[PDB]
Amino acid sequence: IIGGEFTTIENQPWFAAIYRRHRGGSVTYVCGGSLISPCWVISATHCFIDYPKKEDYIVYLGRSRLNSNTQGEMKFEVENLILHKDYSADTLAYHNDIALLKIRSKEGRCAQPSRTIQTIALPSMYNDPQFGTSCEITGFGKEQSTDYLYPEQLKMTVVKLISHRECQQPHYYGSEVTTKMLCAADPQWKTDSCQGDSGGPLVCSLQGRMTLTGIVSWGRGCALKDKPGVYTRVSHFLPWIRSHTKE
Amino acid sequence: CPAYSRYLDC
């Protein structure tokens, strides 16, 4: 996250922190995700495409810090790692950048809601807020595009939804942005997601409810003029989601 | 990697 504030898991209790275990015993952060039901965390396919083995991954919930423990966190194994069949990566962007992780603790239990762990609601199909709506993004991503280290404390910021019409202008993304994607940015270009925030939630208030409206997917640079964050448009994937989870 | 990825491994 570029700009915005430090926060704690309590303000974003659906945020999942996803890590990869390495062959030399080392364990490193991969991506964010969101708890959409007790056994299910949604994220981005591109996070897992290079190393498709569900056994390499650990998911934490209730976690406010990147490399140290938070009181109230719960560790999970991944029972299945469901990647989109139609995922693809361009020279620029990702398509169908959505993934599901079914989680269980070594004790075979799914998420118990907590002061620090809550599920987030999916939107109604094809139902999105209007351009110019303020929304929240959360992550452990870089605080500046040039950093080599990630912050230790979770962060969040607010961005505004951009119209597909405006997102497609040539000095913004053009034809790279499809209707399966949502753009969002600061009107002054001062805040944005960044590397290491991918997979994480874009959360908007849609008809009263805090709704998961997008998944951090890509953008050129972080907080760069005319270059908004781009997100997977969740409302366009409900049937994919219902297929894979109604199990 | 795609040129505009915000993935940590990219």
Cα A213 from Cα A186, distance rounded (Å): 17
Instruction: Mark whether A126 and A158 lie in a shared domain.
Output: yes
Report the SS3 class of residue A178: coil
- Give the total number of structural domains in chain A: 2
Instruction: Mark whether A26 and A2 lie in a shared domain.
Output: no
Cα A53 from Cα A17, distance rounded (Å): 17
Write down the catalytic residue from A34, A46, A186, A193. Answer: A46
Q: Does A31 touch chain B (CB under 8 A)?
A: yes
Instruction: Mark whether A197 and A208 lie in a shared domain.
Output: yes
Cα A225 from Cα A86, distance rounded (Å): 31
A97 is catalytic: yes
Nearest CA-CA partner of A194 in A138, A232, A152, A234? A138
Instruction: Mark whether A246 and A166 lie in a shared domain.
Output: no
Question: Domain with A231 in it: what CATH number?
Answer: 2.40.10.10
| Closest CA of chain A from B10, distance in Å | 8
Cα A226 from Cα A221, distance rounded (Å): 10
Residues in contact with A236: Cβ distance below 8 Å, sequence separation at least 6, in sequence order: A125, A126, A179, A180
CB-CB: which of A91, A150, A219 is closest to B6? Answer: A219
Residue A144: Cβ-neighbour burial (10 angstroms; 0-12, 13-18, 19+): exposed
Would you say A230 and A192 are in contact if contact means Cβ atoms under 8 Å apart? no
- Domain limits for position A196: 1-12+120-235
Nearest CA-CA partner of A15 in A200, A243, A210, A230? A200
Report the SS3 class of residue A76: strand
Cα A232 from Cα A61, distance rounded (Å): 22
Cα A216 from Cα A199, distance rounded (Å): 5
Instruction: Mark whether A20 and A88 lie in a shared domain.
Output: yes
Instruction: Mark whether A3 and A34 lie in a shared domain.
Output: no
Instruction: Mark whether A49 and A171 lie in a shared domain.
Output: no
Write down the catalytic residue from A34, A43, A64, A198. Answer: A198
Cα A139 from Cα A65, distance rounded (Å): 10
Instruction: Mark whether A138 and A183 lie in a shared domain.
Output: yes
* Helix residue ranges, H only, A150-225: 164-167
User: Cβ–Cβ of B5/A94 closer than 8 Å?
Assistant: yes
Instruction: Mark whether A98 and A171 lie in a shared domain.
Output: no
Strands A15-21 and A57-61: antiparallel
**What are residue A184's DSSP bridge partners?**
A161, A229
Instruction: Mark whether A88 and A4 lie in a shared domain.
Output: no
Instruction: Mark whether A88 and A151 lie in a shared domain.
Output: no
CB burial readout A169-185, b (16+ within 10 A) else e = eeebbeebbbeebbbbb
Instruction: Mark whether A178 and A231 lie in a shared domain.
Output: yes
Would you say A211 and A164 are in contact if contact means Cβ atoms under 8 Å apart? no
Helix (H) or strand (E) holding A23: none
Would you say A159 and A185 are in contact if contact means Cβ atoms under 8 Å apart? yes
Method: X-ray
